[PDB]
Design a protein around this ligand. Structure first.
Ligand SMILES: Cc1cc2nc3c(=O)[nH]c(=O)nc-3n(C[C@H](O)[C@H](O)[C@H](O)COP(=O)(O)OP(=O)(O)OC[C@H]3O[C@@H](n4cnc5c(N)ncnc54)[C@H](O)[C@@H]3O)c2cc1C
Ligand SMILES: Cc1cc2nc3c(=O)[nH]c(=O)nc-3n(C[C@H](O)[C@H](O)[C@H](O)COP(=O)(O)OP(=O)(O)OC[C@H]3O[C@@H](n4cnc5c(N)ncnc54)[C@H](O)[C@@H]3O)c2cc1C
Ligand code: NA
Ligand code: NA
Lengths: 422, 421
């Protein structure tokens, strides 16, 4: 069996490794347009580790073409094209193509994040623009605040990390950052950028702002030129796959940032470019290369980070995006002093559930205490179809010096349950 | 005007009271307890009488229930050596763990202390004995080591926290304590205790050990003398209940420590007097006083603690516990350095070899990863397979987690390992 994987990153390396365990005999090739793979960027595994695991790393080769019916792909190394055949093809190409509707976005003064590899332009900057307040955006605001720069943040949605939190859950986080030369512009889109000799002017749907330079923190898209046209694609240009991560054509699969994941209990498609989706989809394709053995469970955009002094975690549907779903969403917020027997710092928890079915659909957490791991529990609760009643009584552990009497996770479900009984 | 009466104003009882109020804003709710005060911890106030009072919860303290009549629905208590009767529409039994019970000869010695019932007897002792290496015993040892006493630990099972960990998982914690004058006697049961003028001698299945005093760290049982003999009970004396927490008689329910809980997947009925079992059964029973609406999920004996520099957590069946079940169980150990190069996180996963259903987990590390046990517990209690655990959602962030969560990894490792075979 010849398993060929295009993309030697999180998704691809996971698929490679997972494939090696399933098929100890199979010939496995990992292809990538880079000099070396194995490290995080802007060193979790060594080429020797892939090698010890009988995985051929064909680097410096950029895939440029495909032939689905003859089952071949073509890469271009040292100016010379070369075709390669496959029995199974796994697309783990990620998303790095910069595609915007911003006029004059090709300014060298507008840094495109992932390509980051601090930098002269930023150090010589006093005021910097950040386009996008998603996870990538907040990371940039963080490093810019450390460098003591003035920051202008542009976000089309209502609040910071909009796809993960509802306004009230991060209102304090924003104020916190506002006291640190961070200036927010929500519900404002960057329409164009004028390059001056010593800076840039962001032309938004509301005004013009001056900055010395800018960081593009919006989600990039999959560079899928090499893609065979017979392969079904989604409107947003991601590759369409079924619950087994197979493309619309025989012997070709796609994982990670290539595809659009699904939040099943609410059967809706969305693009969640996260490391956990990359690792999970990769480990799973490996068991569906010949037979539809294990359905991908889907994604809930589960995330956890730290913005300043605040630990923030999120998973599932936000109440805000509930306007676009059939479920009648309801929510409750719980405040409970941190685990040292309710004496510690406040922990804010929001739970989103279906008001009719009482199924848990989303959760948000904000605190100065690092309780982030609880998001993995809340995520599991939603992913297994629990109701307020189930969450309310799930097992949890108590220890007078380590926890509170009743876990905030269980309490979130109970509080919602009680409120639903008037 | 439903009159709900709750005997026992502790974790279980107070939870039932709170929950009963939520469900019945217009109900008469009485909380009865033989103590003077309520809402204090043990082992500094988690609820004030003023609080329960504000929720219209009739606090009837200094009253000890000594009898009840199921047929006519009444209970009787002794206040100031004068009996009194009280009626109820719904009665919730939430008394706790008090009764001292053991077949040890001479256990009546005054030199053998019962944990929970700076002590003179212990400070005058240089060598103290602890009977039981369960959670209660591990705390006594902790207390004793801090007082710099020499400790002799007796445990019928194979290792410390036997109902929570298999031998290899706590081997380093044992050595850790043995450097602090703790001497362990596993697979050794105390048969009798001889009292001397200045100490005790413990007759064991293997030898005789001298100590100045001893601590009984075995689980105490519910004081159910007042119980109407009409209520069905288990062999260990706990009160039997159906999935909705009702006893075998009309309008009487039992929760917390009076009760035995279940691990449905393996059809195991056991006694696990834990605060989490007390609180959950208390909140659930309040919804089944009339119609059976919500089945109590049961318990996995989920636990988390810290011994020395070690954080230990457990949930479900240990490999050793599994040997007691017909179903064949397997396990795998996973060592993952903590995030970002950090200290080792050691986890063991127990699963059904045939169905690949996750059934138990154990964690040990110098890193506080205990919360991960709540997640593993949810995986088991929810019926996940190794495959489900392998791909469950988890969050990643370079400064806080590893690339692939150890919880997911433990499931994947078992899956892959099973594939090799
Ligand atoms: C600044 C930033 C911060 C982020 N922070 C987080 C975070 O904190 N937590 C989190 O979960 N996620 C985070 N992400 C998202 C995460 O990095 C992605 O979800 C993840 O990289 C996806 O993995 P992948 O393997 O699918 O794609 P990639 O990691 O992009 O790998 C794809 C590989 O394919 C190769 N390739 C592409 N096209 C071709 C071709 N035509 N021919 C040959 N090879 C090709 C590339 O060289 C690349 O190595 C962040 C992203 C950015 C940009
Ligand atoms: C040393 C020690 C350490 C422990 N550590 C932990 C731990 O770390 N984590 C954990 O989860 N659990 C721990 N536990 C167990 C935990 O304390 C119990 O599971 C919990 O207290 C049970 O709650 P309950 O409300 O059912 O009973 P209890 O808390 O025992 O309360 C019963 C109440 O009923 C009253 N009562 C009894 N009889 C009568 C009567 N006849 N009439 C009127 N009132 C009566 C009593 O006054 C008492 O207040 C520990 C126990 C001990 C001894
Ligand atoms: Na909706
Ligand atoms: Na067995």
């Amino acid at each position: 069996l010849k398993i060929v994987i295009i993309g030697a990153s999180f998704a691809g390396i996971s698929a490679a490794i997972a494939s090696r365990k399933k098929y100890p005999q199979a010939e496995i090739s990992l292809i990538d347009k880079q000099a070396t793979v194995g490290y995080l960027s802007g060193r979790y595994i060594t080429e020797e580790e892939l090698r010890r695991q009988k995985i051929q790393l064909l680097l410096n080769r950029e895939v440029v073409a495909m032939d689905v019916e003859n089952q071949l792909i073509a890469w271009t190394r040292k100016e010379e094209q070369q075709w390669y055949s496959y029995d199974k093809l796994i697309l783990a190409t990620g998303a790095s193509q910069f595609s915007t509707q911003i006029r004059g976005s090709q300014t060298e003064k507008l840094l495109k994040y992932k390509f980051l590899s601090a930098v002269p332009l930023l150090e010589n900057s006093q005021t910097v623009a950040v386009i996008g307040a998603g996870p990538i955006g907040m990371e940039a605001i963080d490093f810019l605040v450390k460098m003591k720069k003035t920051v202008h943040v542009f976000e089309s949605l209502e609040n910071l990390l909009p796809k993960y939190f509802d306004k009230e859950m991060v209102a304090e986080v924003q104020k916190s950052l506002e006291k640190q030369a961070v200036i927010f512009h929500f519900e404002e889109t960057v329409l164009g950028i004028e390059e001056t000799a010593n800076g840039i002017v962001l032309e938004t749907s509301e005004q013009e702002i001056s900055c010395d330079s800018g960081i593009f923190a919006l989600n990039l898209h999959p560079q899928l030129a090499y893609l065979d046209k017979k392969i079904q694609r989604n409107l947003d240009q991601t590759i369409a796959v079924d619950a087994y991560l197979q493309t619309s054509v025989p012997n070709v699969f796609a994982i990670g940032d290539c595809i659009s994941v699904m939040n099943e209990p609410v059967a809706e498609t969305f693009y969640a470019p996260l490391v956990n989706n990359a690792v999970r989809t990769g480990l799973v394709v490996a068991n569906n290369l010949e037979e539809k053995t294990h359905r991908f469970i889907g994604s809930l955009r589960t995330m956890g980070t730290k913005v300043g002094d605040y630990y923030l975690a999120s998973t599932g549907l936000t109440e805000t995006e509930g306007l676009f779903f059939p479920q009648t969403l309801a929510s409750i917020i719980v405040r409970q002093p941190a685990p040292p027997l309710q004496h510690g710092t406040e922990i804010l928890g929001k739970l989103i559930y279906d008001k009719v079915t009482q199924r848990v659909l989303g959760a948000q957490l904000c605190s100065k205490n690092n309780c982030l791991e609880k998001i993995n529990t809340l995520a599991l609760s939603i992913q297994t179809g629990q109701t307020l009643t189930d969450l309310l009584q799930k097992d949890y552990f108590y220890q007078p010096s380590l926890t509170n009497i009743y876990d905030i996770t269980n309490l979130m479900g109970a509080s919602a349950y009680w409120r639903e009984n008037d």
